[PDB]
Design a protein around this ligand. Structure first.
Ligand SMILES: C[C@@H]1O[C@@H](O[C@@H]2[C@@H](O[C@H]3O[C@H](CO)[C@H](O)[C@H](O)[C@H]3O)[C@@H](O)[C@@H](CO)O[C@@H]2O)[C@@H](O)[C@H](O)[C@@H]1O
Ligand SMILES: C[C@@H]1O[C@@H](O[C@@H]2[C@@H](O[C@H]3O[C@H](CO)[C@H](O)[C@H](O)[C@H]3O)[C@@H](O)[C@@H](CO)O[C@@H]2O)[C@@H](O)[C@H](O)[C@@H]1O
Ligand SMILES: C[C@@H]1O[C@@H](O[C@@H]2[C@@H](O[C@H]3O[C@H](CO)[C@H](O)[C@H](O)[C@H]3O)[C@@H](O)[C@@H](CO)O[C@@H]2O)[C@@H](O)[C@H](O)[C@@H]1O
Ligand SMILES: C[C@@H]1O[C@@H](O[C@@H]2[C@@H](O[C@H]3O[C@H](CO)[C@H](O)[C@H](O)[C@H]3O)[C@@H](O)[C@@H](CO)O[C@@H]2O)[C@@H](O)[C@H](O)[C@@H]1O
Ligand SMILES: C[C@@H]1O[C@@H](O[C@@H]2[C@@H](O[C@H]3O[C@H](CO)[C@H](O)[C@H](O)[C@H]3O)[C@@H](O)[C@@H](CO)O[C@H]2O)[C@@H](O)[C@H](O)[C@@H]1O
Ligand SMILES: C[C@@H]1O[C@@H](O[C@@H]2[C@@H](O[C@H]3O[C@H](CO)[C@H](O)[C@H](O)[C@H]3O)[C@@H](O)[C@@H](CO)O[C@H]2O)[C@@H](O)[C@H](O)[C@@H]1O
Ligand SMILES: [Ca+2]
Ligand SMILES: [Ca+2]
Ligand SMILES: [Mn+2]
Ligand SMILES: [Mn+2]
Ligand SMILES: [Mn+2]
Ligand SMILES: [Mn+2]
Ligand code: NA
Ligand code: NA
Ligand code: NA
Ligand code: NA
Lengths: 292, 292
């Protein structure tokens, strides 16, 4: 089953992602194929999949940027029916905005079926053009047709997945305790994480004993990523991944506060030094506390 | 012995505090008697007392606002010698800026003796006027003279004192763990704590599931008090008190993130709700984690 989380949905045939055109919140904004840049935030191309509790393999798909929902226009079963962004809610009963999402016959890509119409999300003609129509279209669960096959590239971790990445790490103190604040986290590329750090003003901050020392830098960086999340996205029901860690050196006679983020493969953490914007696989401290 | 910490130094005879005139960082800025408002930040009237490791009962006195040091002009023993703010360091050997501070004959107020001159800090003529001269003056450790007696009104807590206030509280969970980030904290009046909250922009922030929920409010409020500390004071070697707490309700089926501060008497904590600016003696959660 598709997990709850944020996905970049990429056609199996051509390198086009499902895109809410101009990220517009207007009802009836076309959802189109568009090219994408890996290891960036693709601002109009991120979809929060919310499982519908009492319907198997069925979701709403909320555009992270617009906060509007993937909607089959008037729920029509006609091939070529418009797929648009439309106002809704995460657990709607509106079958226009309900999508059964299951593995295709290649066992890696998915097909996306409208719960009402039983027609599939289709990149019309496999057109690779920026702004290519996406429509509801007749099809089957089993056929190879790449127009209707979609890789769900997972952009978020659960709290359980973040916990696992930390526990993997070789720099966790025996006394470590972790404090989980949210359920589902957007993982930033370092390029974006760095940009939030720059736009925070922290690069200009001076170290001062107690009054602006490591703990103030680390907490200011987490607050800045929290502020960026709320200000950047209109969807709800997720957080941005940015950890704070307290650590102690091997000698046990010096402590440090710093940040951490997750690798591209979501499997491991990477330490971030908010006093200089460095990423490190070893920051010279073993974490005894984290909150994220 | 006088503890390390921040003091509002108030004459024993008249309601004048030791004041660095206009908070100026200029060398030779007069230190004067000035009236004060209790339960405010008295911006020009706060002094960080740093104990000199290998000299008994002897300190530097750094003006929290200016970052400059109480200085007996050319270390003269002449009665009426100017006491000014002057550039220095927390552990200087300059005897102009070293002060032996011990209980007076009334056992509650102190006298302040220059280590070099062995003359005392004196509110000349006990003048209660705003801008009254303070000078180094002949005297003795034992005499009653109120011109040379000073209440050291303690405005800061150690980490150990903050730990004690939390442990006192009746809303601490069995599983509580506390994470101490600094050593010495300025305690804010609620009036100031509230102002930092207002000036943060948090009063305008909307609750949003995960993306700006209780943990984001609580951490944004701690970051705002950290930013206010650095931006407001030029002295180093202290922090501003603002805690973050995670808590769980009696039923054990709901958790909440919030802030806390300390009472005027420094003995107890008070909970702060950053989603509405309320102070509560009971926020309906028992803390299982704090960092401050
Ligand atoms: C059958 C029809 O369902 C609803 O209308 C839908 C639209 O629904 C969504 O948008 C409307 C406002 O336009 C409203 O906010 C609703 O709660 C939301 O789910 C939408 O799916 C469009 C485009 O496909 O089709 C229908 O107009 C409902 O509002 C109608 O009353 C009616 O029951
Ligand atoms: C190249 C082309 O691929 C397939 O046709 C697709 C269409 O396929 C879907 O709709 C058709 C009916 O039009 C049929 O129901 C099929 O089972 C279903 O997958 C559709 O994807 C459109 C729009 O993108 O493009 C092509 O027409 C295949 O059936 C054709 O024989 C042909 O190989
Ligand atoms: C005896 C004298 O001590 C020092 O001068 C002090 C002044 O000292 C302080 O300010 C000066 C700059 O004016 C400098 O930054 C020094 O490090 C700092 O402690 C000051 O206390 C004044 C006013 O009472 O008196 C003396 O001028 C030293 O700099 C001199 O070289 C000389 O040794
Ligand atoms: C009212 C006045 O109080 C005392 O005199 C103080 C001064 O006291 C201090 O300096 C004098 C010498 O001038 C002497 O050394 C004394 O032991 C010492 O405390 C001084 O505080 C000045 C400046 O504020 O004010 C008064 O002159 C007392 O000795 C006087 O008899 C008289 O009662
Ligand atoms: C917010 C906006 O993002 C980018 O423009 C989007 C565009 O983004 C995708 O396509 C571009 C090339 O046009 C790149 O491949 C990006 O990596 C993709 O994410 C599309 O989403 C279209 C259609 O909705 O809208 C544009 O605004 C970027 O080019 C802009 O400078 C800006 O940052
Ligand atoms: C920063 C400045 O603070 C206040 O003025 C100070 C003044 O403050 C003290 O005296 C005033 C009355 O003049 C009140 O009692 C305050 O409670 C005291 O803290 C003095 O420190 C003088 C001498 O250095 O400087 C002034 O700037 C306040 O009146 C101003 O509006 C302003 O907030
Ligand atoms: Ca600090
Ligand atoms: Ca959050
Ligand atoms: Mn290590
Ligand atoms: Mn949360
Ligand atoms: Mn309780
Ligand atoms: Mn610290
Ligand atoms: Na439209
Ligand atoms: Na379901
Ligand atoms: Na002067
Ligand atoms: Na000492």
């Amino acid at each position: 089953s598709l997990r709850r989380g944020i996905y970049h949905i990429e056609n199996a045939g051509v390198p086009s992602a499902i895109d809410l055109k101009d990220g517009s919140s207007s009802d009836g904004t076309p959802i189109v194929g568009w090219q994408f840049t890996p290891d960036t935030i693709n601002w109009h191309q991120l979809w929060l999949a919310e499982p519908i509790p009492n319907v198997a393999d069925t979701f709403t798909l909320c555009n992270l940027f617009s906060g509007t929902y993937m909607d089959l226009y008037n729920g029509s079963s006609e091939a070529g029916t418009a797929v648009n962004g439309w106002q809704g809610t995460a657990f709607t009963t509106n079958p226009h905005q309900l999508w059964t999402i299951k593995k295709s016959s290649d066992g890696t890509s998915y097909k996306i079926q409208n719960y009402g119409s039983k027609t599939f999300v289709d990149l019309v003609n496999g057109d690779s053009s920026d702004g290519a129509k996406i429509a509801g279209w007749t099809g089957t669960w089993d056929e190879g047709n790449p127009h209707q096959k979609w890789y769900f590239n997972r952009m978020s971790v659960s709290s359980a997945e973040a916990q696992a990445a930390i526990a993997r790490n070789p720099h966790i103190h025996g006394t470590y305790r972790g404090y989980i604040l949210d359920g589902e986290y957007l993982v930033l590329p370092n390029a974006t994480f760095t940009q939030i750090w720059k736009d925070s003003g922290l690069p200009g901050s001076k170290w001062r004993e107690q009054i602006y020392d490591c703990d103030d830098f680390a907490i200011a960086m987490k607050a800045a990523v929290g502020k960026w999340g709320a200000d950047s996205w209109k969807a709800n029901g997720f957080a941005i991944f940015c950890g704070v860690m307290l650590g102690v050196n091997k000698a046990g006679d010096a402590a440090h506060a710093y940040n951490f983020t997750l690798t591209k493969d979501h499997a491991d953490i990477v330490f971030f030094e908010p006093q200089n914007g460095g990423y490190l696989n070893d920051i010279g401290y073993d974490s005894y506390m984290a909150f994220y």
